[PDB]
């Protein structure tokens, strides 16, 4: 009744499960008919947002990391962190999402406090 849930990506449905057995508590996604599996390491993930009250669209969004240290200037003497790789997960379950986001989200704030 937690961690494991259903989610969809790129029009491909699958099951989303979190793993708190390994060092970097990560989660992997596996499709049922799409014959695909996406392992998203919460470690590499720094951001996590679910859709509550205001957002009844039931969807979980997790972003990787950001390192501006490797940025690059420009003709306008301006720079910025290299556009990372964000991920927006969306399922047709508002109850599930809020159940898996609450467990996967906390880990971010918990990890970020040490990582």
């Amino acid at each position: 009744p937690s961690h494991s849930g259903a989610a969809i990506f790129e029009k491909v449905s699958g099951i989303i499960a979190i793993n708190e057995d390994v060092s970097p508590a990560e989660l992997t996604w596996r499709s049922t008919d799409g014959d695909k599996v996406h392992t998203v390491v919460l470690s590499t993930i720094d951001k996590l947002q679910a859709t509550p009250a205001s957002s009844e669209k039931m969807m979980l969004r997790l972003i990787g990391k950001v390192d501006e240290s490797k940025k690059r200037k420009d003709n306008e003497g301006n720079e910025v962190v290299p556009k990372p790789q964000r991920h927006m997960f969306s399922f047709n379950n508002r109850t599930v999402m809020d159940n898996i986001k609450m467990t996967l989200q906390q880990i971010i704030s918990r990890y970020k406090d040490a990582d």
Binding site: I8, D46, K47, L48, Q49, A50, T51, P52, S54, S55, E56, K57, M59, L60, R61, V66, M88, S90, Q105, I108, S109, K112, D113
Partner: peptide
Amino acid sequence: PGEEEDDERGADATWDLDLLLTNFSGP
């Protein structure tokens, strides 16, 4: 596009609920 979703109604409301824990440094 027009009669689609997951990118106009069912995918545009999670940009205002999180982003406030211990990321991007701070304390």
